[PDB]
Amino acid sequence: PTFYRQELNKTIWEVPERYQNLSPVGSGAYGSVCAAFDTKTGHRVAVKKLSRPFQSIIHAKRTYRELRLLKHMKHENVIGLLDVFTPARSLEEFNDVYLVTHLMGADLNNIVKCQKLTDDHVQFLIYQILRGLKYIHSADIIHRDLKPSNLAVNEDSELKILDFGLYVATRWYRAPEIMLNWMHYNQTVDIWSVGCIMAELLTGRTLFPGTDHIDQLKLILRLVGTPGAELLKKISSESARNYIQSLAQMPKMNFANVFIGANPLAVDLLEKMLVLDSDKRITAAQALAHAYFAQYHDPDDEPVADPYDQSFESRDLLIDEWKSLTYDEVISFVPPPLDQEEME
Numbered sequence: 244p245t246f247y248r249q250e251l252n253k254t255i256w257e258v259p260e261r262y263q264n265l266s267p268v269g270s271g272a273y274g275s276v277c278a279a280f281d282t283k284t285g286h287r288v289a290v291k292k293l294s295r296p297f298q299s300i301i302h303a304k305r306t307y308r309e310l311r312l313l314k315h316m317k318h319e320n321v322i323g324l325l326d327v328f329t330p331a332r333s334l335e336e337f338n339d340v341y342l343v344t345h346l347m348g349a350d351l352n353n354i355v356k357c358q359k360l361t362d363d364h365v366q367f368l369i370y371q372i373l374r375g376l377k378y379i380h381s382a383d384i385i386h387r388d389l390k391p392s393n394l395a396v397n398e399d400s401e402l403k404i405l406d407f408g409l410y411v412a413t414r415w416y417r418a419p420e421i422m423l424n425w426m427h428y429n430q431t432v433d434i435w436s437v438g439c440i441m442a443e444l445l446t447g448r449t450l451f452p453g454t455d456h457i458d459q460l461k462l463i464l465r466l467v468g469t470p471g472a473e474l475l476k477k478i479s480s481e482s483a484r485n486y487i488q489s490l491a492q493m494p495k496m497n498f499a500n501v502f503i504g505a506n507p508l509a510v511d512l513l514e515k516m517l518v519l520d521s522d523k524r525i526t527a528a529q530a531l532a533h534a535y536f537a538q539y540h541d542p543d544d545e546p547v548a549d550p551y552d553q554s555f556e557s558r559d560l561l562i563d564e565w566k567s568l569t570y571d572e573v574i575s576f577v578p579p580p581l582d583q584e585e586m587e
C-alpha cells in the first residue's frame with residue numbers, strides 16, 4: 244500500500260492511503276488516537292499511534308503486551324482490532340505501531356453528564372460493562388483501573404471496555420484493595436468499579452469523591468461500614484492497619500436510604516458489588532444473571548474468551564527481542580470479517 248504523512252498532535256503520522264480524513268480524538272494508554280474513514284469498507288475507525296513503542300524495555304514489553312491483548316479480544320463490548328500496521332518495510336526499519344478499531348464517539352462521561360438517564364438505559368450501560376468483564380475475566384485478564392473514561396461509547400449507547408490488562412489519574416472508581424496496595428486481590432476489583440460507576444449513573448454525582456487516599460477510604464467506610472479484623476489480614480503496612488483499626492466504628496448504611504428513588508433491583512445489585520470483602524463480591528457472570536438486567540440478559544450471547552497465554556509476562560527479554568516478537572504479531576495479524584454476527 245501507498246502511505247502518506249500527516250502532522251497530527253504535533254507529530255508525523257504515516258498511514259496507508261486506505262485511511263483518510265484523520266483527525267485527533269484524544270490520547271489513549273501509551274499513544275494518541277485519530278478518527279479516520281476506512282475507504283475499503285466505508286466504516287469509521289479509530290487509529291492509535293503508539294508513543295515511542297521501543298524507546299525502552301518498559302515501552303517495548305508494553306507494546307507487545309497491548310498488541311497481544313488486543314489481537315485476542317473478540318467481543319462486542321471489548322475493544323479489539325480491525326487492523327494493525329507499520330510504515331516499516333522490514334524489522335530493521337520497525338519503530339512505529341498503529342492499531343485500528345471501530346470508531347466510538349465518546350466515553351461514559353459524555354453519556355451521564357448532561358442527561359438524566361432512565362433506569363432502562365442505566366441497565367443497558369451496566370449490562371454491557373458486565374458482559375465485557377465476564378469475557379476478559381474468563382481469560383484471566385483484569386482491568387484494575389475501570390472508570391468512565393475507560394468505557395468507550397458510541398451514539399447509540401453501545402459500549403466497549405478499553406485500556407484493560409495494562410499524568411494524574413482519577414482514583415474515585417478504584418477498588419479499595421488496588422488503591423491501598425493490599426497484598427492479594429481477584430478479578431472482582433473491577434466489580435467494585437462497576438458499582439461506583441452504576442451509583443453515579445443513578446444519582447448524577449460521584450459516589451466516593453475523595454481528595455486523597457485517606458479521605459477516599461473514609462468516604463467508602465461511611466457507606467459500607469467498618470470492616471472486621473479479618474480484612475486487616477490483607478494489608479502489609481502496620482501504619483496503615485493501625486490507622487484503619489483506630490478509626491471510630493461506622494455502621495453500614497442501608498443502600499435503600501442512600502439511593503433514594505432508585506429501582507429496588509438496582510439497590511440490591513449495588514449492595515452485592517460495593518462490599519469490601521472481595522471474596523464476597525459478586526462476579527461479572529453472577530451479576531449478568533441478576534434480575535436488574537432481566538430485559539437484556541441472554542445466556543446465548545454472553546460468551547467467554549479463548550484461553551490466553553500470558554506466560555510472556557514473567558519473562559525479561561532484550562528490547563530487540565520484544566521488538567521482533569511485536570513485528571511478528573503485526574505481520575501475522577488476520578483482519579476479522581466485516582460482518583461476524585448472525586441473527587439469534
Ligand SMILES: Nc1nccc(-c2c(-c3ccc(F)cc3)ncn2C2CCNCC2)n1
Nearest residue numbers: 268269271276289291342343344346347395
Ligand atoms: N474514539 C475512539 N474510538 C475507539 C477507540 C478509541 C481509543 C483508543 C484506541 C485503542 C485501540 C485502538 F486500536 C484504537 C483506538 N484508545 C483510547 N481511545 C479513547 C480516546 C479518548 N477517550 C475515548 C476512547 N477512541
Ligand SMILES: O=C(Nc1cccc(N2C(=O)C=CC2=O)c1)c1ccco1
Nearest residue numbers: 442445446447448501502503504505506
Ligand atoms: O443528590 C444528588 N443525587 C442523588 C442522591 C441520592 C439519590 C439520588 N437518586 C437515586 O439514587 C435514584 C434517583 C435519584 O434521584 C440522587 C445530586 C446529584 C447532583 C447534585 O446532587
Ligand SMILES: [Ca+2]
Nearest residue numbers: 540541544587
Ligand atoms: Ca439476544
Ligand SMILES: [Ca+2]
Nearest residue numbers: 541543544587
Ligand atoms: Ca438464543
Ligand SMILES: [Ca+2]
Nearest residue numbers: 582584585586
Ligand atoms: Ca450479520
